[PDB]
Amino acid sequence: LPAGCETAILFPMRSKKIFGSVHPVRPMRLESFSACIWVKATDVLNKTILFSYGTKRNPYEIQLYLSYQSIVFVVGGEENKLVAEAMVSLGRWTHLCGTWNSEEGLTSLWVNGELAATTVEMATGHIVPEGGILQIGQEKNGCCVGGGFDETLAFSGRLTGFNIWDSVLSNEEIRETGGAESCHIRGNIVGWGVTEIQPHGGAQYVS
Amino acid sequence: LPAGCETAILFPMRSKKIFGSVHPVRPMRLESFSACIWVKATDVLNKTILFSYGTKRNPYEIQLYLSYQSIVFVVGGEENKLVAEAMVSLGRWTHLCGTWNSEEGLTSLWVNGELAATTVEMATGHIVPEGGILQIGQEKNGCCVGGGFDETLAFSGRLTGFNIWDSVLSNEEIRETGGAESCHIRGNIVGWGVTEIQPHGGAQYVS
């Protein structure tokens, strides 16, 4: 098995209930930070939401969503985003993960350990609100209503290796994280298997 | 029961799940409206949202709550509000009505069939857009988290006569709704026994 890893989460079916609730230990107020997740894209539509962190006044504080052929990253609001062109596939575990800084508004995208896109002065000086809900594999919306999660925004596949840092990673650490010896470097904000991660509405763990 | 009805809710305990969901049948679009209700609050805090219309982008789209010995009438967003003083008392049925106009933002309130507040240029030309939800006694917080709802803003007490109108009601109808046989008088947007009501988390019909 790869990464030295030991566990994974299955989203067997895109629907209006399948999701998981994430409960980070520490506050999410960060100015410069890093995080990574690996993804095995089963379906890629015009939009496929990878995760969602959304606060009451701004459900789009942070959100990564996948389009037909592009990896679109959003900071602060819909206006500021980062997008690649032709580096997303189907039926394969894939690595997508990037850094940001408010001091001078840098944001970037790293696919399989190698930079893919970047923009400067992006949400410069922005400070993310904290105490919100960090949602994964689905945009913030209802689940217990009976459905509720518009399936177009849902995602199908196997997800794992979610780790968030409170600081921007270096390039060598990025390659380390993108290799087959990466499961051991887990995030302080979120450590895979450390932060409580409970699948719901169809999802189950797999290893 | 207050005047001639026999059905009421019971709100025995303001908690992290007690609430009710209403799912009206007809469009919510209104340039003006009217809204009689009778209310029996057990304990009144500085903020207790009896009911409000909320959208994903505007949870304070229409609203009224009791502010200790006061009645706020939140309009459009939090900023636009019409407030009255020293009318509601604990353990007492009180007929609250109210009126609005987008001709020039006229808004008014009426306690026990008698004026409770008034002002103009509130929500001038405002149009409540459609597709949102009306909720009663609860405000936006988690519900399927084994609780979550702000117990502080939850309610405990008795309710009845929950009806709404598509337009402004005059002083004559406002007073008649405070009459002794208003149980047969109900609005068009919502009429008691006509629109769907599903109490939750402790709310009990006392029929």
Pick from A21, A56, A144: CB nearest B140: A56
Q: What's the rounded Cα separation, in Å, for the pair B169 and B35? A: 8
Domain range summary for chain B, segments of one domain joined by +: 19-200
DSSP assignment of A67-116 equals: -SS-EEEEESSTTSEEE-SS---SSSEEEEEEEEETTTTEEEEEETTEEE
Give the sheet arrangement for strand A32-40, strand by strand: A114-119, A106-111, A93-101, A32-40, A157-165, A8-11, A204-206
User: To one decimal place, what's the resolution in Å?
Assistant: 7.5
Chain B residue numbers touching A59 (CB-CB < 8 A): 56
Pick from B56, B140, B144: CB nearest A144: B144
Min CA distance, A178 vs chain B (Å)? 35
Chain A's closest residue to B60, CA to CA, is: A57
Question: b vs e for A88-118, b when ≥16 Cβ sit within 10 Å of the residue's Cβ?
Answer: beeeebbbbbbbbbbeebbbbbbbebeebbe
CATH 3.90.110.10 at A2-202, yes or no: no
Q: Which residues of A touch B (CB under 8 A)?
A: 21, 56, 59, 143-144
Give the determination technique: cryo-EM
| CB proximity list for A172: less than 8 A, separation 6 or greater | none
Query: Cβ–Cβ of A143/B144 closer than 8 Å?
Result: yes
Residue B13 CA neighbour count, 13 Å, CB half: 6
CATH of domain B19-200: 2.60.120.200
Q: How far is C-alpha A1 from the geometric centre of its chain's CA atoms?
A: 22
Q: What's the rounded Cα separation, in Å, for the pair A48 and A152? A: 7
Q: What's the rounded Cα separation, in Å, for the pair A19 and A36? A: 19
Take residue B4 and report the two structure tokens written for it.
């001639």
Beta strand pairing call for B133-136 and B19-22:
antiparallel
Q: How far is C-alpha B187 from the geometric centre of its chain's CA atoms?
A: 13
Min CA distance, B204 vs chain A (Å)? 20
- Residue B159: closest CA among B22, B62, B17: B22
